[PDB]
Design a binder for this molecule. Structure first.
Ligand SMILES: *[C@@H]1O[C@H](CO)[C@@H](O[C@@H]2O[C@H](CO)[C@@H](O[C@@H]3O[C@H](CO)[C@@H](O)[C@H](O)[C@@H]3O)[C@H](O)[C@H]2NC(C)=O)[C@H](O)[C@H]1NC(C)=O
Ligand SMILES: *[C@@H]1O[C@H](CO)[C@@H](O[C@@H]2O[C@H](CO)[C@@H](O[C@@H]3O[C@H](CO)[C@@H](O)[C@H](O)[C@@H]3O)[C@H](O)[C@H]2NC(C)=O)[C@H](O)[C@H]1NC(C)=O
Lengths: 142, 186, 141, 185, 185, 186, 186, 185, 142, 141, 141, 142
């Protein structure tokens, strides 16, 4: 039942955010999963996804009551549900396998989209996928 | 721009197309005499390198399409014109800036009485050190190590001393006065 | 007469749709624009501001081709191409009265929106307004 | 981060929310032992001021929510921990970065023959001056002014002198060899 | 008596009876704190001898019943009390004089604008180097090598800068003013 | 003979007839350029006197018919030819010796990476200080205060660095190698 | 007059009419080479001022009609002629004085024996430093920083040394002897 | 033995049996106070090595059963006791020699007349700088840098000045006279 | 009765001393009343006079038994009497309002004469004049 | 013959009256006079001493006009004017045999008194005494 | 043929009598001789060694005239004078193959004795032995 | 009976040693009586002789069983007898009146011969000569 928790309409809105942002040299600092340190395809996503949600509040922001601002609140509402399709692992590992990037906002959104797109894809195959205790795979990161 | 001695100051330049920043090969220069161009430092893809002469005195950094030439601490030598040349591929664009350095004037007054034939002639002295244009005057040039300019003037007053007496010092639009009011003895 | 009916209400809306869309950040950029303090007259301010806006959009506002916003820009440039006729030209004062602003893209779009909106309102009031040759005003700069 | 001697280097800190850049009261420190704080410089609303001790050695500049600490030219002194204090109203956030400065090792070999009781014992010497961790050993600590560490080792060879002899020097992962092949006589 | 820096100065002593001049054994001293005595020189029957420390700085000569102590060129060190010991046989008479040395005050004004948090606070500085009593105050102690005393005072002016501003410096009765009228920018 | 830097070294001479030692007027010389002869010291009847210039650097003593010129501590200046002239009455005999001084080579290797336009070009340096004939070479001149000779060579390696890389240094028949194996970072 | 080195010395002058002292404009001079006149100091109405060069080395004071030029401490440079010019109104009077400085001679004797070919030839040395006229002689010129004059003479004595041997040194009428009596060894 | 300053000097030691020279392990020392030993140099089988401190000041060479310690140029420092340690297997023999360095005395005479209370007292001065035992006395200790000892004596002569006056200076057996015959005035 | 204590013959002798001294540049140091510090005409004289007497012994001196030496002794005899026409004030003030002068002997005598002449003049008007307690007027001096 | 009766006893008295009159002080002055040591002969000493005394009084001894002492000086100068005839002159040795004395005025007057008194006594003894030409004595100086 | 019978047994004995006689000491001296290492061939080694020995005895071995040893030397020089004929000469290599030895006199006499003894034994074996011209061997030096 | 203790044959052998040694520049160090310090002809010899015997062992050495080596042993045998013709003096003085010489071996032998020759000569005159207590004459030496 988690396979169709993430609606297709959600990726549609995200694509709009991307295709609706202005192109510039501008660059910012944001937290995100260290891809090199955490290479396991499944645990990487599980962690990447949970991370995006904390990041989303203060990173992806728009004027209140705008089409995009609504798109963001919808993505948050979506997570409140998903909170069940994931199992708690451990608190030590929050901020583990995480690094920092200094890159353009468009490049961030591309990462966020990519994370939502792959996440949805994996869920379609198996809705029980993100119940995994990745504690051991988190341990390698530093 | 205008900046005072010892202060941090920044000259800026930028690339028209806002999409590009790191791609631009930035290079700042120092216009010496005779339209001479002394390479201060360079930048490209956020790899900065300052020529060793200017090292520590100048630095370059970027934010989006804008490029900054930061003067860590200005000295009188730095007064002059600078040049930023930005290049994308074969096409190049240039921007020119004039940094005017200023040393707040220092007006000093002091006196000393004649030692012969008597002790009646008092000579007050007005000395003003500033940059770029010091000027001293009583109301009735030497170069320093800093690169500044000192200049001074004397006034002889036979007894009776017609005090008070005023000297006017100024650095262009900057100005200050020095007034000798009374001697130590009478 | 025909100038009054060119800048459509719809154009101002799309500009707002671009602004509302933009993501909020500390990011700042350097762009050319008219110095409001240097040249304070409102009528001439719009007059010159406009000539810059046309060269501005090319380098400043960019979106992936065929996106709602990229298309929105094309509608504005076309609008501007025909509009140049409704303005009298006084080109020597180019590079004069222009100053560089280090400001966020939102502040920029707000400046551009302000120009188009102020323009529309002023044109509606008078289609013959822009016969003035503020060459003197430019000298004040 | 890691950087070599003399090179330009930048440590970074940032504000959690991307909305704010200038509003943040940034201030960088140089952490001496005991995590003691020495003020390098401050920034607020793009008005920067570096303390005169560090003037010319360090600079601060901003881009969006990011805050840079620029090392104009790094020397051994700079190796250590740095701390950024970012304050907005009643909230304050601290971010810590570690700058590891490195001086490329310099391996040198030189020999001498004993002068007493005879001229039969050849002592070859392998010297490696690096930072932070020079190391020398033969295949069979002094402090400099620049702040680096020199170390050396001697190998005695009774006649007949078994040559070649190799000494392995290295600075952590950096490494080089020195081989004395033959004497002059 | 009172005398300025560098000038020639003479303190005097004399014998009560006008009959005797040469017969008197004159000797001058420099009184350090605690009224301690340091011998400057002696005179008797017009034969003078100055101690080598004070040689060239002090001299003694006679005219009738009077005895002069000449300061060739006065410096701040000389400021203090001097004592003349005049001895004739079993009687001895002492006369004390006070030499006050003065260095004409030097009033200087100079300003700087704050570099943090902004460039809005102008701090003008009034410096007065004099002796023995320099004094500075705005209208609204360091020791030098020459032995004089420098003192200074700062006045902070938030924007808008209320100019002119006057500072009054003085050395006892000696006095001078300094006025910052306008900045460069 | 051959002797290394700082070592004690002795040149010898003697009188044919073994009966006589002290009777011989010995005198050693230092062959400067242009067949110049600089008197080092003398000896006769065991009364020795060294000229003050060489004093402490050279000494003379005798054992039977043999005469010794002792170099307390050799320096590069001492490399050259010496001369011992022995005289009995009017007849004289001369002996010539060549003291070759040697300073064991010192091969040093070190690297530093480009600071612009990138940090990809690593330049290793091989420096060899020896005497009399230093020589440096990569496998793909300055004078010191000691009187020795320093010489050095550089090698530029674009990434990928084809390490290891070897430099060969040698002083005539003396030889040593320096190999840079790996950088600090990768 | 005559005065020795380091001593205080006074040249004098006076005004014929005993009624007047302070009224007289006194001025002393220093006769350099070529009848040059270097103003030492002045006096009038008991206001004295010495030119800064001579400051501390010379002073002027008065007693009645007599005027005094006091040399705080004499040095060899001061040997020469001085001039006092007194003026009352337009009429002037001049007095001339010759200060002869003297540095008491210093006669020193010492010896050293030959180091080659033997230790038999003893050479005694007699050195006499005085002013103005040093002179040394055995019975069978350099300038010092003081301004004085050193001169010395040597005597070679083959064994048997005919000791005692005397050297006579003198400064004009001043005189002293130095006698080497016996060596340390024999 | 005895030797003068700057001259070359040799102390000797030897082996009892004339059969052996090279076999003996010779080593010379410089005896500081308390008969403490400072190693000068060693010799064995004609292989010599002088310690770097004494290098150039001392040398060792052999002739038959004799062993020489050569002082290139003697200075006051060298004056003292020297000890030779000769070792052959389990036996060891020690021989001690005393080097007395001498600096030829330098007798100087110079006079001054009193400057106070009058110019009537002539004080002639006799100065003798020698080593090891300078001595001065009139017929009626300071240490130098070279290591020698200067001593002087003053003789006061009230007017009339009884001249000539003779002062006798000497360094042990070495001796010289100084005679002030007449003043300049 | 003090008005005719100082005879006219006394000033006559003093004038002779003056007109009988030799003119020179010679100058000496002597104590005398500070005229600037003590300006009151009456107390100035009272103090000036008493001061002259101590000064006279060692200052104005001549060969014994000469006309002038006699003149001096007569002036002293004159004072021994006047000692009654004056009232004691206080001992603190001896050496107060007094300064030192370095000037010619003739200039001293002119001061002494002047003091005797004015003193006699004031006494002629009122013989009770010098009974005044000038302690207060002495206090100002320093 | 007439020289014997010129220097009156009365003149010596007045000189003493000046001396007795002078006030005693440490004061000293510089004046020209004959060097007694340099030229020791008593007869010639008075001879030269006199020529100086005449130039001396003008500059040395001064009194307010018409005082008993000022008049006393005039009587002495007049006396001297006529006296010059009783002395033979040998002028080259002027500036020779003269030395400067730094001495008290009393010591001076005593020197002058001594000269006049010694003179009177010697003249009384012999009026023809001063025929000598001590040019040789001056050379001794 | 005649060379075989020249070096008498008696001559070797006397040399030993000189050696046995010498007093033992640490004393060492410098003398010229053939470098054994530089030229290793035994037959040529004796050949050259001999030419040196003749010049050697004059300067090296000395005794008071007419002593048993002084006479012993004379018998050896005479022996050598006639012997030169039994040796072929190859003189350019003189000063070549000679090295200086710093050794005790006993070591010297032992070297000389060794030469004469080795010589006698070798001559006895072959009188025609010394026809060789080792000029090549000298070049090896 | 001590007069003919030293045979003439002994000097004969010593002369041979001398005339049988090689002449060179060689020089050695050996102990021997200080001639200047000890000038008494009789005590000088008595001490010189006893000294030669200790010196002989290690100074005058030859190959074992040679003519000269035998000559040396004979000289030693000779002394063992003479030990009676001498009287013990004191032990303090051993190494007193003794100095060191650096000279050729021939010069040493000449000294030794000279000592044996004079010793024999004195004994011929008086066989009781070397019974003298020279302690006092030893004392002067230093
Ligand atoms: C102000 O005046 C005083 C004297 O009243 C000066 O102090 C004196 O300075 C002199 C030298 O300038 C000192 O004598 C020196 O002695 C040293 C050895 O100690 C010698 O090497 C020098 O050649 C010289 O003779 C003297 O000791 C010193 N103090 C006194 C009390 O005599 C002072 O220098 C003057 N200036 C200032 C700025 O104070
Ligand atoms: C007298 O002779 C003695 C030696 O017997 C001299 O003393 C020695 O002097 C040398 C240098 O002149 C000293 O060596 C020096 O060491 C320093 C480092 O400490 C180095 O920088 C120098 O290059 C030099 O090598 C030596 O230590 C010293 N003492 C001894 C016992 O060796 C002395 O200089 C001679 N002259 C006089 C006036 O004493």
């Amino acid at each position: 039942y988690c396979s169709h928790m993430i609606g297709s309409g959600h990726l549609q809105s995200l694509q709009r955010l991307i295709d609706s942002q202005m192109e510039t040299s501008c660059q910012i600092t944001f937290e995100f999963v260290d891809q090199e340190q955490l290479k396991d395809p499944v645990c990487y996503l599980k962690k990447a996804f949970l991370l995006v949600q904390d990041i989303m509040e203060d990173t992806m922001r728009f004027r209140d009551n705008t089409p995009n601002a609504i798109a963001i609140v919808q993505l948050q509402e979506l997570s409140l549900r998903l909170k069940s399709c994931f199992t708690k692992d451990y608190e030590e590992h929050d901020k583990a396998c995480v690094r920092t990037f200094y890159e353009t906002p468009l490049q961030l959104l591309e990462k966020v989209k990519n994370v939502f797109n792959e996440t949805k894809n994996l869920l379609d195959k198996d809705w029980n996928i993100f119940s995994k205790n990745c504690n051991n795979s988190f341990a390698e990161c530093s | 721009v205008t900046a005072f001695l010892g202060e941090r100051v920044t000259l800026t330049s930028y690339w028209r197309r806002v999409s590009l920043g790191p791609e631009i090969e930035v290079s700042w220069f120092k216009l010496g005499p005779g339209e001479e161009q002394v390479l201060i430092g360079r930048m490209h893809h956020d790899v900065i390198f300052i020529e060793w002469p200017f090292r520590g005195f100048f630095d370059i950094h970027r934010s989006a399409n804008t490029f900054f030439l930061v003067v860590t601490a200005a000295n009188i030598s730095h007064d002059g014109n600078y040049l930023c040349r930005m290049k994308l591929g074969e096409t190049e664009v240039t921007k020119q800036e004039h940094l005017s350095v200023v040393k707040p004037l220092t007006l000093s007054v002091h006196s000393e009485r004649s030692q012969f034939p008597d002790f009646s002639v008092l000579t007050v002295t007005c000395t003003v050190n500033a940059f770029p244009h010091p000027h001293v005057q009583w109301l009735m040039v030497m170069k320093e190590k800093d690169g500044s300019l000192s200049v001074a003037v004397d006034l002889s007053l036979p007894k009776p001393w017609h005090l008070p007496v005023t000297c006017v010092g100024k650095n262009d639009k900057e100005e200050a006065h020095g007034v000798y009011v009374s001697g130590y003895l009478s």
